[PDB]
From Swiss-Prot:
Interacts with p53/TP53; the interaction is direct. Interacts (via CTD region) with CDK9 and CCNT1, acting as an associated component of P-TEFb complex. Interacts with RELA (when acetylated at 'Lys-310'). Interacts (via NET domain) with NSD3, CHD4, BICRA and ATAD5. The interaction with BICRA bridges BRD4 to the GBAF complex. Interacts (via NET domain) with JMJD6 (via JmjC and N-terminal domains); the interaction is stronger in presence of ssRNA and recruits JMJD6 on distal enhancers. Interacts with NSD3. Interacts with NIPBL. The gene is BRD4. This is Bromodomain-containing protein 4. JQ1, a thieno-triazolo-1,4-diazepine derivative, and I-BET, a benzodiazepine derivative, have been tested on tumors with success. Treatment with GSK1210151A (I-BET151, a I-BET derivative) has strong effets on mixed lineage leukemia and promotes myeloid differentiation and leukemia stem-cell depletion. Belongs to the BET family. The NET domain mediates interaction with a number of chromatin proteins involved in transcription regulation (NSD3, JMJD6, CHD4, GLTSCR1 and ATAD5). The C-terminal (CTD) region mediates interaction and recruitment of CDK9 and CCNT1 subunits of the P-TEFb complex. It is also required for maintenance of higher-order chromatin structure. There is a cross-link at residue 67 (Glycyl lysine isopeptide (Lys-Gly) (interchain with G-Cter in SUMO2)). Phosphorylation by CK2 disrupt the intramolecular binding between the bromo domain 2 and the NPS region and promotes binding between the NPS and the BID regions, leading to activate the protein and promote binding to acetylated histones. In absence of phosphorylation, BRD4 does not localize to p53/TP53 target gene promoters, phosphorylation promoting recruitment to p53/TP53 target promoters. Changing residue 108 to A: Abolishes binding to acetylated histones. It is found in: Nucleus; Chromosome. Residues 26-132 form the Bromo domain.
Length: 134
């Protein structure tokens, strides 16, 4: 038979939402710090680039990525969520960072370049978290 299954093709899933009008939201001092200090310091770091947007499994040739990672998260999404006042509290935002880092550790192996990057970003994150306003 002449159907060789060359189509349909793969794709990336839809990215995480950055807007949800019926979601409860608040501005808090802790969230303002998470944007101004935590996100902005990580964003400019030389290790930020793999984490500045959703994993593009097509471009990066990671066809297994979304078979393994079912709760994707990235700093581009977190930045948009902070700019859009999406969060109710600091915990919701911190959980997004934790998810991002954990996804990287799940998908990859200790000592991989991308894991070294995530570990360094996570160390910085945890340092900035320890100065969160009370
Ligand atoms: C192995 O390639 C990757 C693994 C990943 O886990 N999480 C992300 C995001 C991620 C991205 C890639 N691909 S990559 O081109 O960004 C890449 C980054 C680094 Cl620091 C090292 C290798 C590499 O691709 C081979």
């Amino acid at each position: 038979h002449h159907h060789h299954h060359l189509v349909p093709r793969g794709s990336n899933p839809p990215p995480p939402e950055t807007s949800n009008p019926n979601k409860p939201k608040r501005q808090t001092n802790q969230l303002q710090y998470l944007l101004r200090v935590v996100l902005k310091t990580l964003w400019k770091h030389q290790f930020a680039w793999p984490f500045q947007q959703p994993v593009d499994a097509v471009k990066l040739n990671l066809p297994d990525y979304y078979k393994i990672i079912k709760t994707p998260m990235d700093m581009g999404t977190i930045k948009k969520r902070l700019e859009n006042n999406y969060y109710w509290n600091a915990q919701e935002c911190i959980q997004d960072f934790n998810t991002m880092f954990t996804n990287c550790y799940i998908y990859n192996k200790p000592g991989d370049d991308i894991v070294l990057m995530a570990e360094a970003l996570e160390k910085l994150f945890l340092q900035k978290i320890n100065e969160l306003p009370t």
